[PDB]
mmCIF file with all atom_site columns, C-alpha atoms in Angstrom:
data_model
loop_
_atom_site.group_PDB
_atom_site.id
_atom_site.type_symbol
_atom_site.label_atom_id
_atom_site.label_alt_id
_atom_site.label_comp_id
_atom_site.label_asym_id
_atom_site.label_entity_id
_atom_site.label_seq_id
_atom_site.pdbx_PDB_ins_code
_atom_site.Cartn_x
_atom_site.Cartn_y
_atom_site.Cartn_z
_atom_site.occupancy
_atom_site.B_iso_or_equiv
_atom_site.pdbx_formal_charge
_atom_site.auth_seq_id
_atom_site.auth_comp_id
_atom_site.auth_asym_id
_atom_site.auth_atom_id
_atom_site.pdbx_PDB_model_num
ATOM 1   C CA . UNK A 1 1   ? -11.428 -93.022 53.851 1.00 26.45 ? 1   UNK A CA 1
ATOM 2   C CA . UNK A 1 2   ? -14.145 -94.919 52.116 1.00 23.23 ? 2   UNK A CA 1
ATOM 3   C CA . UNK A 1 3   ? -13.973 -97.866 54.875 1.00 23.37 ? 3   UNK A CA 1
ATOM 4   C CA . UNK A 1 4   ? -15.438 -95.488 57.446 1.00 19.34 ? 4   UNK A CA 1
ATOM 5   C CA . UNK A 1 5   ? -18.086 -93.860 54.556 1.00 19.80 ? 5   UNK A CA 1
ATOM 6   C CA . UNK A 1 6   ? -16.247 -91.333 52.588 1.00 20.56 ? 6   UNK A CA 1
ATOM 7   C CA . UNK A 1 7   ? -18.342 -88.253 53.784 1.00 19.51 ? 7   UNK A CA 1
ATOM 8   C CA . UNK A 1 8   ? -18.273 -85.298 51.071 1.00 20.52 ? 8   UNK A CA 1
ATOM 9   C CA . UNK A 1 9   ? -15.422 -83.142 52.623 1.00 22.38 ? 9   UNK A CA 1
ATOM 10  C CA . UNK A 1 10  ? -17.105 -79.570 52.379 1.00 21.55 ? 10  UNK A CA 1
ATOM 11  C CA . UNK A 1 11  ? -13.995 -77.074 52.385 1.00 20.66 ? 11  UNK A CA 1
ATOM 12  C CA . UNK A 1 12  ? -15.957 -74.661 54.112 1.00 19.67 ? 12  UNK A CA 1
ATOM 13  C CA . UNK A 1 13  ? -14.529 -71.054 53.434 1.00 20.37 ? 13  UNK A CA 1
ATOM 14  C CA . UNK A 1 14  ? -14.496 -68.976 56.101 1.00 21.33 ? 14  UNK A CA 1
ATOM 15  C CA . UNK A 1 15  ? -12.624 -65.671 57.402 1.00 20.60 ? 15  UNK A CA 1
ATOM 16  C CA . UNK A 1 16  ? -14.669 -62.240 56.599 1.00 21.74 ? 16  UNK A CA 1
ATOM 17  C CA . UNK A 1 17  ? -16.010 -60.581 53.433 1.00 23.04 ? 17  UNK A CA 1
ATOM 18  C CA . UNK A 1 18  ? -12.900 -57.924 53.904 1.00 17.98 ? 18  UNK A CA 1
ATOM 19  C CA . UNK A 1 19  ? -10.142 -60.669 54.124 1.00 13.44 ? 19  UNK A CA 1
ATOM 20  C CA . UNK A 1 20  ? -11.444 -61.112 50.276 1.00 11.04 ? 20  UNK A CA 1
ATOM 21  C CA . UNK A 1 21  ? -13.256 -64.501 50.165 1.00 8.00  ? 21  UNK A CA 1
ATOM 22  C CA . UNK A 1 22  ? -15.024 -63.487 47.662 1.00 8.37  ? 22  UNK A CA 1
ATOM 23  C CA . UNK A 1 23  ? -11.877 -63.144 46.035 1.00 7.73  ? 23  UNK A CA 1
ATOM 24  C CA . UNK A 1 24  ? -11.211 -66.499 46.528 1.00 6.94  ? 24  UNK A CA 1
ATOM 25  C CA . UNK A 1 25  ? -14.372 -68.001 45.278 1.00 5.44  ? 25  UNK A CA 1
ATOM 26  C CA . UNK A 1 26  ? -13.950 -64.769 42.092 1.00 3.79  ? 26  UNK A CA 1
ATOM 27  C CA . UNK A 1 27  ? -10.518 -66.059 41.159 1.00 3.28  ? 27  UNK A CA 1
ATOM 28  C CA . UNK A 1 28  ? -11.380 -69.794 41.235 1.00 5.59  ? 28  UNK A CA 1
ATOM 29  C CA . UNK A 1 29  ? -14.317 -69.243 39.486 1.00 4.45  ? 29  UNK A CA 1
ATOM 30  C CA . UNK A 1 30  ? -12.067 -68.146 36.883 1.00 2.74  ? 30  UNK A CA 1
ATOM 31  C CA . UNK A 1 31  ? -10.568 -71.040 37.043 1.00 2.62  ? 31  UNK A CA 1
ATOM 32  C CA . UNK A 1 32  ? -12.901 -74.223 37.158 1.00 3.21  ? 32  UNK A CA 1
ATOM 33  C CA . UNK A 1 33  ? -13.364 -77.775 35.920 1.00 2.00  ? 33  UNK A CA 1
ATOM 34  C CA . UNK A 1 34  ? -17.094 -78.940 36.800 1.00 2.00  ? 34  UNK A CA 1
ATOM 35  C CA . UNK A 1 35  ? -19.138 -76.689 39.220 1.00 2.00  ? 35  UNK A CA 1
ATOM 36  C CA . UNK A 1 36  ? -22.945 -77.333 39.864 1.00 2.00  ? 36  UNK A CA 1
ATOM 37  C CA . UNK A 1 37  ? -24.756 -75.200 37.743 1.00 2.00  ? 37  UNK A CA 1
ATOM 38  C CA . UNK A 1 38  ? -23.929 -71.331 38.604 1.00 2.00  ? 38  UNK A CA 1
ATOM 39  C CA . UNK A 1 39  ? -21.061 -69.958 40.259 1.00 2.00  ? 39  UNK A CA 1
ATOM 40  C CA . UNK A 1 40  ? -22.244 -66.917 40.326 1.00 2.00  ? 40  UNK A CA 1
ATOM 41  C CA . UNK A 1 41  ? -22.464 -64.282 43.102 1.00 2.00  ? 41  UNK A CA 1
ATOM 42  C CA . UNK A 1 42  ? -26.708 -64.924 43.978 1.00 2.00  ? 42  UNK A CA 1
ATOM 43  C CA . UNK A 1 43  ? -28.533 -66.156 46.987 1.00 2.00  ? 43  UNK A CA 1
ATOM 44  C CA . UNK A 1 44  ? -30.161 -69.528 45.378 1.00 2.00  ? 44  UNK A CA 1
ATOM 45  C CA . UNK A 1 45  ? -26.334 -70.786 44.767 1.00 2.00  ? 45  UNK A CA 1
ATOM 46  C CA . UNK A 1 46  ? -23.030 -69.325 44.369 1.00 2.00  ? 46  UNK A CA 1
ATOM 47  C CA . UNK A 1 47  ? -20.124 -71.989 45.476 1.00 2.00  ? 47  UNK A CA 1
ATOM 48  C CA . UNK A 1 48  ? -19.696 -74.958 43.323 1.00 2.00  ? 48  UNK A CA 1
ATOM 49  C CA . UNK A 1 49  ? -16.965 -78.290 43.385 1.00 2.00  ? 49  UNK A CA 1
ATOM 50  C CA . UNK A 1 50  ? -14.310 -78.382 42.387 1.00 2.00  ? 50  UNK A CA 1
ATOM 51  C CA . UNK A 1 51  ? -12.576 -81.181 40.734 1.00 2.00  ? 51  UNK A CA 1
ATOM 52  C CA . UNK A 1 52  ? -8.895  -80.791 40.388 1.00 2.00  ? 52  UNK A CA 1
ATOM 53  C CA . UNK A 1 53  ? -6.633  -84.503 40.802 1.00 2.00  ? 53  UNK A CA 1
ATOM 54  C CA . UNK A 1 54  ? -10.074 -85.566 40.507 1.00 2.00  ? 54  UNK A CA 1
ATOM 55  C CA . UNK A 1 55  ? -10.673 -84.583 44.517 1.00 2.00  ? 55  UNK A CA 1
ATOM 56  C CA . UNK A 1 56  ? -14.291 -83.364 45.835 1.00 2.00  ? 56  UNK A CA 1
ATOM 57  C CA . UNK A 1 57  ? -13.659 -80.073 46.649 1.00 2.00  ? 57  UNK A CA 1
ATOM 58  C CA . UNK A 1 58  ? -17.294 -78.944 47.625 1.00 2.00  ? 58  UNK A CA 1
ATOM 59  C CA . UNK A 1 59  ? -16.816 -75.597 48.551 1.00 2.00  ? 59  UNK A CA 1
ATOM 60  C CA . UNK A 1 60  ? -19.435 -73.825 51.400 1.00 2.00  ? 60  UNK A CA 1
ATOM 61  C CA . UNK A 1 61  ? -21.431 -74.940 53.556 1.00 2.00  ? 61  UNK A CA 1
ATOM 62  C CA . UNK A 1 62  ? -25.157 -75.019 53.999 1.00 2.00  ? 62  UNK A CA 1
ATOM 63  C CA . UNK A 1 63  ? -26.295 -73.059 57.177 1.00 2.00  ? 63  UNK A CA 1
ATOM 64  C CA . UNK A 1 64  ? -29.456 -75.195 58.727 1.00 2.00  ? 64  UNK A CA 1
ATOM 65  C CA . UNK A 1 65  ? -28.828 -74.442 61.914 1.00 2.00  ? 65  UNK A CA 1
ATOM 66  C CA . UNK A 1 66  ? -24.709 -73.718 63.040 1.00 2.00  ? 66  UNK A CA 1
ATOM 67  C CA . UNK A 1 67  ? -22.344 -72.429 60.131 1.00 2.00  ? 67  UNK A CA 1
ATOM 68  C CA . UNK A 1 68  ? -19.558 -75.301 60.008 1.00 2.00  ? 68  UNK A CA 1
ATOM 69  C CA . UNK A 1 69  ? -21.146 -78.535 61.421 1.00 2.00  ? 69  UNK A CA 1
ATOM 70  C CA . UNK A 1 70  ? -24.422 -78.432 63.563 1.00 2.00  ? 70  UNK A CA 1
ATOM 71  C CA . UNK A 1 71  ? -23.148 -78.661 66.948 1.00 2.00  ? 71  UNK A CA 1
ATOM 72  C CA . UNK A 1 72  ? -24.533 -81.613 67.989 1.00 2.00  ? 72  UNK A CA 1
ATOM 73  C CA . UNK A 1 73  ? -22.868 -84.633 66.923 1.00 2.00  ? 73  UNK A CA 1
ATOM 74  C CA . UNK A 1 74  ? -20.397 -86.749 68.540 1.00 2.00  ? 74  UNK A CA 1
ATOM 75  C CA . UNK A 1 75  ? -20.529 -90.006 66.490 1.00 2.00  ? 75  UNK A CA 1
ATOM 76  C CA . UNK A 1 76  ? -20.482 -88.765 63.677 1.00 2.95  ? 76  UNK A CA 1
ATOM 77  C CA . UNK A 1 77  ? -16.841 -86.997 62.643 1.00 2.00  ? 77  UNK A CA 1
ATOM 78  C CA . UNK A 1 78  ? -17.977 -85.461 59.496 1.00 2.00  ? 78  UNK A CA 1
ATOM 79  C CA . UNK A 1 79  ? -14.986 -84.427 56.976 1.00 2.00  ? 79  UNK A CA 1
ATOM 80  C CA . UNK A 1 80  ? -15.634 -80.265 57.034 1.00 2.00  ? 80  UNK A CA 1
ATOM 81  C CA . UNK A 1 81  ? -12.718 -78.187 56.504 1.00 2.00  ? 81  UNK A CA 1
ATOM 82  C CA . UNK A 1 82  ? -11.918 -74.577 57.762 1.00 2.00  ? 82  UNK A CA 1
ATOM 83  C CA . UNK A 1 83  ? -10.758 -72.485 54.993 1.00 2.00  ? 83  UNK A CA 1
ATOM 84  C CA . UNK A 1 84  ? -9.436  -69.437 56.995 1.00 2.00  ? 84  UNK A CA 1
ATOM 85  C CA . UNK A 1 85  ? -8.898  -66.406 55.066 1.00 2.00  ? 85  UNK A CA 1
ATOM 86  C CA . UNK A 1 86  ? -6.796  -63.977 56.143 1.00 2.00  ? 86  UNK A CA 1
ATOM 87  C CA . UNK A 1 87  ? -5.675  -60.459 54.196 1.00 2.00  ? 87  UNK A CA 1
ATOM 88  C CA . UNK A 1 88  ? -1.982  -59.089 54.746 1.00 2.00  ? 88  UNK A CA 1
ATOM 89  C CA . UNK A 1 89  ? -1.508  -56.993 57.647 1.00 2.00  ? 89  UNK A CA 1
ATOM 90  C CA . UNK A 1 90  ? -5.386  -57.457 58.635 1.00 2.00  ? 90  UNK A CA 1
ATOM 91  C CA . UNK A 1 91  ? -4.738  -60.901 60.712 1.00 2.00  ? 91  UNK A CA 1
ATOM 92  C CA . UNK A 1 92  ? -7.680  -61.751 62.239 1.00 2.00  ? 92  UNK A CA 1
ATOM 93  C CA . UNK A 1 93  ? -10.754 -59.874 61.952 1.00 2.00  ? 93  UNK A CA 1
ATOM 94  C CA . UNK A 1 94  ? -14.456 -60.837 64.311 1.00 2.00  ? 94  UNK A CA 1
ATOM 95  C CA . UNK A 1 95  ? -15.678 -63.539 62.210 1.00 2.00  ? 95  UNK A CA 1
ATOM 96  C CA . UNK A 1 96  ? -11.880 -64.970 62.124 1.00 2.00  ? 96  UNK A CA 1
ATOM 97  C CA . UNK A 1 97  ? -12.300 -65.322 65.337 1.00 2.00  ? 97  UNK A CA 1
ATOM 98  C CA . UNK A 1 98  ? -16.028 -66.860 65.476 1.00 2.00  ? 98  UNK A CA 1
ATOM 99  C CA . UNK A 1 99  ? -15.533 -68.989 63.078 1.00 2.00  ? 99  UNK A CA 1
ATOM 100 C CA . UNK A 1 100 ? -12.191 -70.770 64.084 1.00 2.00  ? 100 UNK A CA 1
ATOM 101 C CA . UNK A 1 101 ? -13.450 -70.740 67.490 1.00 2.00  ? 101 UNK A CA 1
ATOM 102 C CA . UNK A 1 102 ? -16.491 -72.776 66.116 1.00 2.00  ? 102 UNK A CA 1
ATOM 103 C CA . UNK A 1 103 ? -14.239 -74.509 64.034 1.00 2.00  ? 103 UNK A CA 1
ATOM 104 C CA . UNK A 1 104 ? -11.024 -75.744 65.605 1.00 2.00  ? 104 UNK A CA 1
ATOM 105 C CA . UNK A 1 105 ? -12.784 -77.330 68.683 1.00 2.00  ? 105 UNK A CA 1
ATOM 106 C CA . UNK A 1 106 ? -14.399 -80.290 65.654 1.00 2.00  ? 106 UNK A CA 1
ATOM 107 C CA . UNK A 1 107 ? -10.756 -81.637 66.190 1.00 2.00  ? 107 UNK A CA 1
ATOM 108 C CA . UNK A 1 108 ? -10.296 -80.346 62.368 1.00 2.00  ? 108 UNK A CA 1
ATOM 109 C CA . UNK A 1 109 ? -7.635  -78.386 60.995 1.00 2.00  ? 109 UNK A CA 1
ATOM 110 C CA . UNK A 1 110 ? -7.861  -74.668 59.686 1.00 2.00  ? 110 UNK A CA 1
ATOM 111 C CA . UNK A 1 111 ? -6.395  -72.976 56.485 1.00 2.00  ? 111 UNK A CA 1
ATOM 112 C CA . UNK A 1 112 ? -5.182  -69.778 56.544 1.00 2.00  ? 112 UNK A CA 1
ATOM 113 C CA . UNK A 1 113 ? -5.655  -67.982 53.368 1.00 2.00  ? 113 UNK A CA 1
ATOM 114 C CA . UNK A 1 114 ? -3.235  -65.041 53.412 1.00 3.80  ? 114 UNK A CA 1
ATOM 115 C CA . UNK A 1 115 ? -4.612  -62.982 50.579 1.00 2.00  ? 115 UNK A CA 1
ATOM 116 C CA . UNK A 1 116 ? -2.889  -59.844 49.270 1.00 2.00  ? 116 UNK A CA 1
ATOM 117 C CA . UNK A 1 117 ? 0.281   -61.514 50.094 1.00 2.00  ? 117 UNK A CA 1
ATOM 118 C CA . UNK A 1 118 ? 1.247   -60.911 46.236 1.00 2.00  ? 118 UNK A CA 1
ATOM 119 C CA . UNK A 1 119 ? 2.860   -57.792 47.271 1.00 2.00  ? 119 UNK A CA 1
ATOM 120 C CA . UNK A 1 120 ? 6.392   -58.586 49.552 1.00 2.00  ? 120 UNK A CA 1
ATOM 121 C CA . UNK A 1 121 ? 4.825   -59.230 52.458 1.00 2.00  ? 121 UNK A CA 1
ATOM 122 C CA . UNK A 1 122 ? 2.947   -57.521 55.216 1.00 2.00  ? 122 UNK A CA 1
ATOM 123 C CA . UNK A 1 123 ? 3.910   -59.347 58.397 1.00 2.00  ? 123 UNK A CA 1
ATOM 124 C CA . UNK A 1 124 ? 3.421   -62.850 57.758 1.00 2.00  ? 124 UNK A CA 1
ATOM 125 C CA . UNK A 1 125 ? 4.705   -63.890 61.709 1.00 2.00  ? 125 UNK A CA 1
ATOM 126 C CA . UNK A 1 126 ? 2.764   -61.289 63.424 1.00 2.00  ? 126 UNK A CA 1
ATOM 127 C CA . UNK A 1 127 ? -0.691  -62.565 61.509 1.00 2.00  ? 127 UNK A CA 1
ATOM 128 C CA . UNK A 1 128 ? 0.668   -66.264 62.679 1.00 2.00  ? 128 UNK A CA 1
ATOM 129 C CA . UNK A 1 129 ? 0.817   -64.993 65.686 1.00 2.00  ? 129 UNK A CA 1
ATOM 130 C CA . UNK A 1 130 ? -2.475  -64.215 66.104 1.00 2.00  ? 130 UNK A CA 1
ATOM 131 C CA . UNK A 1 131 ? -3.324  -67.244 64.582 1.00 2.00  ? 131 UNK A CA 1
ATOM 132 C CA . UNK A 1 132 ? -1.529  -68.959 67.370 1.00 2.00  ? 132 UNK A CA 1
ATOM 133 C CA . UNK A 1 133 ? -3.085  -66.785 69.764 1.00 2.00  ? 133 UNK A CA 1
ATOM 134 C CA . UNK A 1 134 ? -6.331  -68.936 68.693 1.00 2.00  ? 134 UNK A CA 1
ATOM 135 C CA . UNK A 1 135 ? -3.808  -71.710 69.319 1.00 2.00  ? 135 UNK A CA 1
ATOM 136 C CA . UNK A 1 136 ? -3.687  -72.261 66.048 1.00 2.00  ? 136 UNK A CA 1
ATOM 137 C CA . UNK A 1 137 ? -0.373  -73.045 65.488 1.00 2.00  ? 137 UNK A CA 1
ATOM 138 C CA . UNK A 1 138 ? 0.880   -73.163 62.351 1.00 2.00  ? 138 UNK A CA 1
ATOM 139 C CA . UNK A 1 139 ? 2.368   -76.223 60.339 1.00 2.00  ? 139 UNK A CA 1
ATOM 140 C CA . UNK A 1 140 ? 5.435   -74.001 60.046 1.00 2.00  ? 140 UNK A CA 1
ATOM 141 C CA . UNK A 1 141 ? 5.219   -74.258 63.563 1.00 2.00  ? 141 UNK A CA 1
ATOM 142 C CA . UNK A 1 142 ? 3.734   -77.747 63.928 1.00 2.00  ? 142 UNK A CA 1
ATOM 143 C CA . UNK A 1 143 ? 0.517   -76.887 65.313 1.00 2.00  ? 143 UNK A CA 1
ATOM 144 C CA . UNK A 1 144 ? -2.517  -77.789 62.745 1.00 2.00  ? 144 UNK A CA 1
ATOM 145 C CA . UNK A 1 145 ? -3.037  -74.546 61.205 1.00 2.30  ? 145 UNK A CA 1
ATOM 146 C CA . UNK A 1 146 ? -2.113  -74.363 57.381 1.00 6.60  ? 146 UNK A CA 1
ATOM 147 C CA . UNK A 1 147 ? -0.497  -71.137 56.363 1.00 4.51  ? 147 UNK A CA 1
ATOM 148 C CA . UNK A 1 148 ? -1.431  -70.491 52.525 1.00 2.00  ? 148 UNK A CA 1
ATOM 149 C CA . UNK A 1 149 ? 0.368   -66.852 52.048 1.00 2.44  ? 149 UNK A CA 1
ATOM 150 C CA . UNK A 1 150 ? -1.441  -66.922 48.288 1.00 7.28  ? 150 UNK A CA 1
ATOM 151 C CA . UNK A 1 151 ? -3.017  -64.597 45.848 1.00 8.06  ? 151 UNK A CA 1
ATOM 152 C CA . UNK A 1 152 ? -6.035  -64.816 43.812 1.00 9.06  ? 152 UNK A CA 1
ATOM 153 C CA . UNK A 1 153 ? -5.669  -61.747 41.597 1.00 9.90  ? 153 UNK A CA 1
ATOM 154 C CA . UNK A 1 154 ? -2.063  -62.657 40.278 1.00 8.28  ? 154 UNK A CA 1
ATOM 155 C CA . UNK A 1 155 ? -3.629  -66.219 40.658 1.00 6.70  ? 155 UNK A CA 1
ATOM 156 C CA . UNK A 1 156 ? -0.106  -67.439 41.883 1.00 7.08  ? 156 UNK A CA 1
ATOM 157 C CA . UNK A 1 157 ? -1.074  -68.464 45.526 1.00 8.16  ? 157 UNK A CA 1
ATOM 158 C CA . UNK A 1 158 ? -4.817  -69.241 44.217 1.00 10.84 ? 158 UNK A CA 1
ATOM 159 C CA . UNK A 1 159 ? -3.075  -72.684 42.680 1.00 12.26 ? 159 UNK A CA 1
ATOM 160 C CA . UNK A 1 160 ? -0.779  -73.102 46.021 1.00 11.13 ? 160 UNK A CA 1
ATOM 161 C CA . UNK A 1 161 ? -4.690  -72.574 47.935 1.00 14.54 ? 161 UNK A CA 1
ATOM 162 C CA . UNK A 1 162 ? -6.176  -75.774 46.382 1.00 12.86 ? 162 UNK A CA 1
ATOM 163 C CA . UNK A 1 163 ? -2.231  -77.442 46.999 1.00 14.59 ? 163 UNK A CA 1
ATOM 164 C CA . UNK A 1 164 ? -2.695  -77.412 50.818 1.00 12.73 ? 164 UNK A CA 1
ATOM 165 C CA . UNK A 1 165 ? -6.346  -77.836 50.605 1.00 12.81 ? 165 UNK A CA 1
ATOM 166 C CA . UNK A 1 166 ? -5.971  -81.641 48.583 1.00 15.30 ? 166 UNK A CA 1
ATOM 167 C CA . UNK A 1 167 ? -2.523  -82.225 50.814 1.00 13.22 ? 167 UNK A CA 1
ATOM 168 C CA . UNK A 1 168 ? -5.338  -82.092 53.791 1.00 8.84  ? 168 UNK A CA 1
ATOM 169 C CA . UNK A 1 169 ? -7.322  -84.947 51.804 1.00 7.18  ? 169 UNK A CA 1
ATOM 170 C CA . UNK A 1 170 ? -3.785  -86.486 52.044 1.00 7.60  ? 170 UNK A CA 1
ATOM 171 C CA . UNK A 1 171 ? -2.648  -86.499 55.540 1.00 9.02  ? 171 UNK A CA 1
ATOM 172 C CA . UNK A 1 172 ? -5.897  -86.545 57.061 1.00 10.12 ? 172 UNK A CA 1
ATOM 173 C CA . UNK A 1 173 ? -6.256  -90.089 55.879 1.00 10.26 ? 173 UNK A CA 1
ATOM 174 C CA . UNK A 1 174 ? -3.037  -91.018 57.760 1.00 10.31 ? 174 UNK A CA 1
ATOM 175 C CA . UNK A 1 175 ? -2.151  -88.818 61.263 1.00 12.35 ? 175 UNK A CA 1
ATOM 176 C CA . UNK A 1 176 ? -2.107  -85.277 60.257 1.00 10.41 ? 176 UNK A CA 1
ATOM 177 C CA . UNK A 1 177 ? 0.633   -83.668 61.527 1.00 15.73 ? 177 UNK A CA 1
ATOM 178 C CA . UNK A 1 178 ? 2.343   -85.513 64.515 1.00 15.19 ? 178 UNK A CA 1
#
């Protein structure tokens, strides 16, 4: 909330380059309402925000010194959100791993981002699973992992992405899950 200083909550996308997050920013940027300046795909920019229900959705973090949140702050809960893209039967690649690791212990939940889930279905509950075996847990499951089985080509689950991402902003501001 506001009361507290409403820090910018940066929905930091994270998974791998294979897991198509690329895809993700690709497809959205196909689909945007404001940006910055250039969404495009170049080392002085790239990500933008995103204003859909009228919700900051800065997207991407700036590395300084840690990707996701310097690690060094206690007072200071900041708002970051871990976008965690996933890719069918792939589950959880390396920098899945590194980056929920990094991510999951702010006391923040994670997003997975199933992409190429716009064919019937790879194994959903195995690639949970795994998820879990982070401890992430989904909300299916009532852990505080959000399971987004989207798509961003057939741009059906790219709308449902930015659904869980806002129902975050939502929840957040009360108790979460429990």
């Amino acid at each position: 909330g506001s009361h507290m200083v409403e820090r910018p909550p940066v929905v930091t996308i994270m998974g791998h380059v294979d897991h198509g997050k690329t895809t993700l920013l690709d497809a959205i940027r196909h689909s945007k309402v404001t940006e910055q300046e250039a969404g495009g795909i170049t080392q002085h920019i790239g990500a933008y925000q995103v204003t859909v229900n009228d919700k900051k959705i800065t997207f991407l973090d700036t590395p300084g010194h840690e990707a996701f949140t310097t690690m060094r702050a206690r007072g200071a809960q900041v708002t970051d959100i871990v976008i965690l893209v996933v890719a069918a039967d792939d589950g959880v690649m390396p920098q899945t791993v590194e980056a929920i690791n990094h991510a999951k212990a702010a006391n923040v939940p994670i997003i997975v981002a199933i992409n190429k889930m716009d064919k019937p279905e790879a194994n959903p509950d195995r690639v949970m699973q795994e998820l879990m075996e982070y401890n992430l847990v989904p909300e299916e499951w009532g852990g505080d992992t959000i399971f987004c089985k989207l798509s961003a080509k057939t741009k059906e689950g790219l709308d449902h992405l930015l659904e869980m991402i806002l129902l975050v902003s939502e929840m957040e501001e009360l108790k979460a899950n429990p």
